Structure 1
Amino acid sequence: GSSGSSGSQQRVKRWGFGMDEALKDPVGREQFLKFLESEFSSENLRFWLAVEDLKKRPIKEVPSRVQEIWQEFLAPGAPSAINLDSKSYDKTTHNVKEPGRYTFEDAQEHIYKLMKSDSYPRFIRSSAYQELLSGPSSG
């Protein structure tokens, strides 16, 4: 919804519970991400989201993206080039062959199970997250 209501500090806290919540809210998604980019970890998340949306994309932009997403993080010469286990990575590489909607479903799990307690955790440790709670502004 375009419109909202008063009460951001309370909302933020939600994200301090687990990536899950952070994702639900729009601001929490970008906020939590920001910190990632800094630690050059965003790649993990960036890829995740790409998947959730991937399916959303039309059949015309379904396949075209498949390879793309895999060429962004699931690629060797890529910027967000992520890293996955052997058993997992192997399965993915094979799935890629045929572009679909849940082709990268497997990976989504591995990463998700990671970022959840991989990056999210730090977010709480750092202050960037606290900022919102208090109020990131002059005063």
Structure 2
Amino acid sequence: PSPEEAQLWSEAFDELLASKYGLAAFRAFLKSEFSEENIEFWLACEDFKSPQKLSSKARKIYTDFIEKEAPKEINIDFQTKTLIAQNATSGCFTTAQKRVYSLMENDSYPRFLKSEFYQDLC
């Protein structure tokens, strides 16, 4: 908190995700809106972005986030899901990461800024 640091997050979304306490506040909020799989997927995409570990991590991520009826199935379209499924490479999830990033930025993130949990901190 600060709120110097806190206040700063409403200017741009990269600030929030960049800071430790802020990222925790937002994950808390997404958990409260049952959309937490997004922040998780993005957090996974960064740890993703060895090739035996690149191969490894990819399958784990797929089962968790992309397979049909998956436990943490993220909300992307079919054109993105397939090119994801077809294409153990570094830039693999780039498109999916960007979509989920936008999903959080456009929908959840504004509401986070208007919550009292952030309005108090600030």
So what's the TM-score if we normalise by structure 1?
A: 0.79
Paired residue total: 122
Map residues 4-23 of structure 1 onto 2, 5 A cutoff.
8-23=2-17
1:34 aligns with 2:28: yes
- Matches of 1:79 and 1:33 in 2, distance apart? 17
1:109 to 98, 119, 122: 98
- Matches of 1:24 and 1:90 in 2, distance apart? 30
Give CA-to-partner distance per residue, 1:40-69, whole Å, 9 cap, x none.
1011111011001113xx444322111111
Map residues 110-125 of structure 1 onto 2, 5 A cutoff.
110-125=99-114
Select between 38-47 and 58-67 the one with higher mean Cα deviation. Answer: 58-67
For residue 84 of structure 1, what is the aligned residue in structure 2? 76
Where does structure 2 lack aligned partners over 5 or more consecutive residues?
A: none
Q: Percent identity?
A: 39
Q: What SS does the corresponding residue of 2:90 show, helix, strand or coil?
A: coil
Q: What SS does the corresponding residue of 1:119 show, helix, strand or coil?
A: helix
Asked which structure has the greater CA Rg, the reply is 1
Q: Is the 8 A contact 2:74 2:100 kept in 1?
A: no
Map residues 52-91 of structure 1 onto 2, 5 A cutoff.
52-55=46-49, 58-91=50-83
Pairwise CA distance, 1:105: 0.9
Residue identity opposite 1:78 in structure 2: A
Q: Is the 8 A contact 1:18 1:120 kept in 2?
A: no
Q: Is the 8 A contact 1:48 1:108 kept in 2?
A: yes
Where does structure 1 lack aligned partners over 5 or more consecutive residues?
A: 1-6, 134-139
Residue identity opposite 2:64 in structure 1: E
Larger proportion of helix: 2
Pairwise CA distance, 1:32: 0.8
- Matches of 1:101 and 1:123 in 2, distance apart? 31
Q: Is the 8 A contact 1:9 1:132 kept in 2?
A: yes
Give CA-to-partner distance per residue, 1:66-117, whole Å, 9 cap, x none.
111121111234321112112212211111xxx1211111111111122111
